[PDB]
Amino acid sequence: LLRHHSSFQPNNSNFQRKAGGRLVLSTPDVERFVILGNYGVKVHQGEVTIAGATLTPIDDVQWVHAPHCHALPVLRTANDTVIELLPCPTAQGLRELARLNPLFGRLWNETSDTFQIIYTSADAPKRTSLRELASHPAWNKKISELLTSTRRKPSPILFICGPKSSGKSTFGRLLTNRLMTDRAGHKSRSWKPVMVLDLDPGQPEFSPPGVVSLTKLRRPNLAPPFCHPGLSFGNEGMTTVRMHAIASVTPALDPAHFIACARDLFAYYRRSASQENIPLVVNTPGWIQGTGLDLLAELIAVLRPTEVLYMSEDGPEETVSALREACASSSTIPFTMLPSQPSWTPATLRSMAMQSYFHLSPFGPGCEWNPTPLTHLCPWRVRLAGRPDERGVLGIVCYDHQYAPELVSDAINGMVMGLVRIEKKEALRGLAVPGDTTPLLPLIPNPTGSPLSPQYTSLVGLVLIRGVSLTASNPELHLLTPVPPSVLHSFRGDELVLVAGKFDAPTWAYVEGLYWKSNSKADEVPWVEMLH
Amino acid sequence: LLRHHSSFQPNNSNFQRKAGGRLVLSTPDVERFVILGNYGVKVHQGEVTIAGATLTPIDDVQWVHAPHCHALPVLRTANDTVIELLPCPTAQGLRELARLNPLFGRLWNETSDTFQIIYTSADAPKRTSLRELASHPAWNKKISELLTSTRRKPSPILFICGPKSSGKSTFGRLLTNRLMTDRAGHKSRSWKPVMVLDLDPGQPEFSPPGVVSLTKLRRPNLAPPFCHPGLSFGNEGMTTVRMHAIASVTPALDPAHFIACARDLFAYYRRSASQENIPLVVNTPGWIQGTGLDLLAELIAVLRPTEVLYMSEDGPEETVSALREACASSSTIPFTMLPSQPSWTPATLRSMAMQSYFHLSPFGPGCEWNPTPLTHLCPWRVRLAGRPDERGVLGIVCYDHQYAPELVSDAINGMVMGLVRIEKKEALRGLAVPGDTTPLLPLIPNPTGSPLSPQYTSLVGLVLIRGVSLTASNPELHLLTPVPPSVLHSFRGDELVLVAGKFDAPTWAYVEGLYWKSNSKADEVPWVEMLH
Amino acid sequence: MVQYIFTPWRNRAELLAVRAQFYPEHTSSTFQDDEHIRSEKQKAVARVSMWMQRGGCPHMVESTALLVAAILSDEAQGSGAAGGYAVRAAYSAAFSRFVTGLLDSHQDKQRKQSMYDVAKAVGLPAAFVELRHQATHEQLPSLTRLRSAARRALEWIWWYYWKGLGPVDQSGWVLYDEKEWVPKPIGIV
Amino acid sequence: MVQYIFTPWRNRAELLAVRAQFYPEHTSSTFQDDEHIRSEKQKAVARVSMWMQRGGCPHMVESTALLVAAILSDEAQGSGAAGGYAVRAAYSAAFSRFVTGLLDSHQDKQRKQSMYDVAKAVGLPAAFVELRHQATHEQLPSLTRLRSAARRALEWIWWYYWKGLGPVDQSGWVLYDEKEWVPKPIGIV
């Protein structure tokens, strides 16, 4: 049975094309649009609403990425509204990632244009089901009350907790977009920046997997997490204030350090919130039982949120009771229960986010992608032999598990590692940094196995070990990273530390070259066996 | 509601007393009797049936023990039948065990006589429910067919397998009694001996717990297992042919040795069955899943039974299928499924059996008990220092677990140990017997942990370590055993070996003296703490 | 009336000595002191092994002996050549026995209880339950986590069980002569 | 089409070398030979620990490494002073992981299957399942039983998994020069 996604009907008057692939659409009444692919929204007259974001003719062009792996945002136009749809320039690069992974081929529309308007279900690609973005009426009422309280009280803190697959991420995106874009009274009011504390390592937003981050947004989040996996450090639409490497998909390897990371990130938010009023939206892990419940209680005790929002009505009574106790122990903190509106597994989305992060170019749209396979790129050579001033990295620190020194080279090879800047010398205390150096790797023994201190270290970015050369003439690491060369050359060698953790093995990078060669057509690769 | 156990009604004619407590009862019609306590049956005229045993005036007096912990045997008299009921002389000693354990006081009738006829439920002792001995009609039909086949084919082997609490023991007792006492044709036919291969260590009959045995019976088994826990070695009614110490309640510590024990015992049965035709009844553990199912299959393969009898209709289909496969693999062995007619836990009955074994006098009635507490008896002193000819025991062998040599004295103290006769020197090969000897105990290291070989060793009996004296002047073991002094003095010191296993801790013996003192009235005892 | 509880130890002094050997710091540096502490801990774990052989030993004593044995095997020699599966496996079996025994003791068959609910009812941290589940159905937990959890578990067992015990400060075979015999309790010479 | 399975080892030669180090007697006395065998087994167990850290290691390889590590800890030094809870706990955790992984792999949620039924379906002896249950819900099994079951389990894993693998016989950071660069697979220098 055909389901009508878009209520718009085109004719010669309302719907017109323009050179460069752009489109001009004039709706005299309220209309809805479900558009699949990458596009840009710029309204000539009237007000539109997309994913909770309100756009007016004063506002600039907003770039939307809508793969059908996630729910497609619905663009609603009020009466007497003239809008312009623009093709996305950078999107082609992302589509060229289809050459490296079959998963990136299924994401977008099959039409030659970047974006396709989905009038009926027949316009969908074959063997794919399109789901529209939806919000509960209770969600809209709660966000309206939150906006009124935010106008009453400057810089609120909104804690969003819930079970996994409860739709907390969708509610977080609409909450952020409505806090940013919605203006009451004067239409000349500018958009407010919104600061997002992303504390979910397993399913992160604005950060690569295994990373907790603090992000400042002046532009609405209209893209999936893998469409903006890495944001450059700080006038841009989305800038990253600070990151820390959990180096795992779950905090269960070290909960307390996790809490410490949150504290440090919260401190930086305070160093903004003193100067200007900025709402903070906190994204939490989907762990509601066992150690995760204690983690949520500790996060409530640390952050002191203005409100706590549990995203499931039908959640376990022990979890709701523990969260209510954690709220009531501090002060009168309003705890509100919300409905949970709930293909692609989280592990696959995590791998897509990591691949999209590593394919970011070092250099409307924010992010740009490089279609070149990781096997074809010229790698960074990090010198391992010499004085700590001479070496590219100070040493290698293993998180939670101490390999034998002969096994470190095999363990880190072809694996994602974190790059950590040592801001203060107090982080290295208690650890034996190797001195002036087949030569061995510079390995810092970590007998406790705990991560480095968040308040003295920061995360520059993630690297992928292209190879390890332990020859006596030139001991070095070949590695690939999306960090720009200016940032890498700004740091000194004694400030940088490579960190091994429990990131997932980048198995996409191993067969990326094989997929590229197979697509271009129409020896033994390490860690890959082939069926025939 | 009153339930009539005995259909007999007394008057001056049928019911007569005689001095010494004996009773003469003449029933012109078929009558049933439920008698609680210890008595003796000797019929002057007619045929009676008790627990499947048929008694005729030719037969002698048969002694019955009926505590209400087990089901009371029902004595059925045919038309025109005159019987005599006799009090049991030895039973007093067993009743005096009530002075040492409150469990032994609950067993018997409250009337001053040894036996009481239970006409109605009001004649039962207070707060006790009396259950009659019952047999399924399918059981009686199967036993009748087995008797016909036994008359057709000399010396059958009847394997009785089933789940725990399936009533396999009751069926075994009635099967043994009907094979023994039932005579067809000529009434001058004598009773046949029946050999019982008891392979159940957890709930044994004719043997103490942890012991597998081969027993020859010329007299019907009308008593519970704790009323005949130890039988003297070989014209008696019940004699023990061979014994082996599993030293555990389950074969799971060593299955294969268990099978080996069965082989040896079966061999001795063959050394009888060649001379005369004797039926063998095999009692098996109530283990029907996991390793126990393989044990049952191995026992079927070893013994080659004439028939296999599974005691549960509603048993697991995998167990019945495995038993059917084990039967059909050897030959056409008839496998018959039977109904399972199913307070006192098996552990309590095991403790009562062990206590009754250790309270047996060295000298319908067969067994006689000693009311004296084990703390008051003069113990055997076993010399531990000297040549292997000079020492009382050759050494101490631990089964399945090797203590440190300093911990052996604490481990064996106040615990039940087996006394093993080394018949052949091949049993000690591979083991280091200690030479000419605080002096240490003579300890034989057993790195394998396997038990001694059944075909070269035998079990004289069980001992209880009264104490360990490791003084330099006289290293010795004080121990208590029901084995007669003539048997103990027959063996040489180098033939005897003490065996430590996984018998239950004799906690009855520790507080036996306290219970005796408390009953007679109306310091710190090792391993006992007292509530007040 | 008088009720009897049967214990694997002969008297309470033996149990308190074993408690002192498990916990020298609570009951009461140099290399001789460290060697003495290690030897006394080994003696105590051997005694608890004998007690478990006898039967009637409480679950907390067995759990303490297992955790102390795992800690001793860690401290004596780390299996760095073998990657530590010996040490990590000892820790994992100690935690499996400890958490399984505690949960099986305090669970109720009448009411459907999650393992985290039983852990909350006892007061056990859920870290031990997650560690047991990871050691069972996933790969073994790392050695640092097992060390930290073992120390915390030993402190938890001390506060749960060990503190409440007390204040902390034919000549071979001869029948024995009937004239000189005096009746004694079983186990006393 | 072409399907890719990602392995913790770089190539099949690494896996076959680790198989040879676990099983020297099948793949192919003096004290030097015994020390060499022990050292190679330690190296192999360390490699499998690294493989489990990387991810994607099969359950049979992990079970073999755990059993070999338990056997090595038994052979190197027995905890006779500590009563053997270190060694017996290593054996018990190895068996818990081995039986739990095998049963969880071969169980079906659609049909209610007893653990002994799954053990019969796999071909695993029920002694290992009973040993797992005793190590979990009861006291640890004895050291002799754990040794015998460990040797039988290693033989079972050899016949199940290992035999089928094959026949048995700013100068710190410099961008690399684009002229000299030749594209290679990931992990090759």
Author numbering:
A (entry chain E), B (entry chain B): 107 to 340, 348 to 455, 468 to 488, 495 to 568, 608 to 692, 718 to 727
C (entry chain A), D (entry chain D): 1 to 28, 38 to 178, 344 to 363
Authors' own words:
Here, we isolate and describe the conserved rixosome from Chaetomium thermophilum, which consists of two sub‐modules, the sphere‐like Rix1‐Ipi3‐Ipi1 and the butterfly‐like Las1‐Grc3 complex, connected by a flexible linker. The Rix1 complex of the rixosome utilizes Sda1 as landing platform on nucleoplasmic pre‐60S particles to wedge between the 5S rRNA tip and L1‐stalk, thereby facilitating the 180° rotation of the immature 5S RNP towards its mature conformation. Upon rixosome positioning, the other sub‐module with Las1 endonuclease and Grc3 polynucleotide‐kinase can reach a strategic position at the pre‐60S foot to cleave and 5′ phosphorylate the nearby ITS2 pre‐rRNA.
Once again, we observed the spherical density, which we attribute to the Rix1‐complex, and the butterfly‐shaped Las1‐Grc3, both arranged in such a way that the shorter edge of Las1‐Grc3 is preferentially oriented toward the Rix1 complex, with a distance of about 35 Å. While the cryo‐EM reconstruction of the complete rixosome could only be resolved at low resolution and did not reveal any apparent connecting density, both sub‐complexes could be resolved individually to resolutions of 2.9 Å (Rix1 complex) and 3.0 Å (Las1‐Grc3 complex). Characteristically, the Las1‐Grc3 assembly displayed a two‐fold symmetry as observed previously, with two copies of Las1 and Grc3 and without densities for nucleotides or RNA, thus representing the apo‐state (Pillon et al, 2019). Strikingly, AF2 multimer predicted with high consistency an interaction between the Las1‐CC and an intertwined bundle of two CC α‐helices formed by the two C‐termini of Ipi3. The Las1‐Grc3 has a high degree of flexibility when attached to the Rix1 complex, but this is probably necessary to fulfill its specific function on the pre‐60S particles, reaching the C2 cleavage site for endonucleolytic cleavage and RNA 5′‐end phosphorylation, which is also in the highly flexible and exposed part of ITS2.
